[PDB]
Design a protein around this ligand. Structure first.
Ligand code: ZN
Ligand code: ZN
Lengths: 4, 138, 138, 4
């Protein structure tokens, strides 16, 4: 799960 | 941007939640990568009451809206990251598409309103966390 | 419905204003058939920053959205009614289209946001009060 | 001007  | 504002709710990726989100917590689910907090203003968005599997989302890295076809929500094993250990993520809809660091939070929309929000991606896929079953938002 | 809500403003036909509109008056213009009142909530609408002369409006009598082509805003002599004496109404855009009693207030929209609101009609025309110059709303 |  992403959020970079 | 990066959140859904419906009624007196703000919906965000759990992994991107703020201190103020946690202070005003309404509901959160790590297995969905979702968090909902209380707001003081009424939001403008509407949750899609539908089963659309095509729509448009905003891509942060490209600053563009893109049309997309995506799978029905499913349980998907998602590999470890600095945000979660390897785990099953539920309610996840996959499309072929571009993604880069910082794209999580982009809102996916159809003719009926908000469908979901970018949560995951990699290997040429973009995974969107479906919100359409959260009927208590609207 | 029947009003434009932008920021902390509500825009309505002057002839349809309520007591609460007048209590919270910000601005009004009989020659435009417009009134703007203060609101306590933030609105969802955006005023079109454009010169579009095609768009879509909601027709109350038909409960339908219709596409429409309309003239540039102009000074138009409007005949007497129970709402105004015969007078010049400015900022008025005319289209060919259906109208009936109760259609005033229908919002006209383009790709850039809100363009105007149904104010007048008759003899096969619908007249929309342009709002696009009210840049202080947004 | 309308409002009927
Ligand atoms: Zn839909
Ligand atoms: Zn326009």
């Amino acid at each position: 799960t992403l959020g970079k | 941007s990066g959140a859904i504002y419906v009624g007196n709710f703000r919906v965000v990726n759990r992994h991107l939640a703020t201190h103020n989100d946690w202070a005003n917590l309404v509901w959160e689910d790590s297995s969905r990568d979702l968090l909902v907090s209380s707001t003081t203003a009424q939001g403008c968005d509407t949750i899609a009451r539908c089963n659309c599997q095509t729509g448009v989302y905003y891509c942060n890295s490209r600053r563009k809206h893109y049309p997309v076809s995506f799978s029905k929500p499913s349980l998907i094993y998602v590999e470890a990251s600095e945000y979660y250990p390897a785990r099953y993520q539920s309610h996840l809809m996959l499309a072929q598409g571009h993604s880069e660091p910082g794209d999580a939070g982009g809102i996916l929309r159809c003719q009926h309103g908000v469908v979901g929000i970018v949560s995951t991606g990699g290997n040429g896929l973009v995974g969107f966390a479906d919100v359409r079953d959260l009927l208590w938002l609207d």
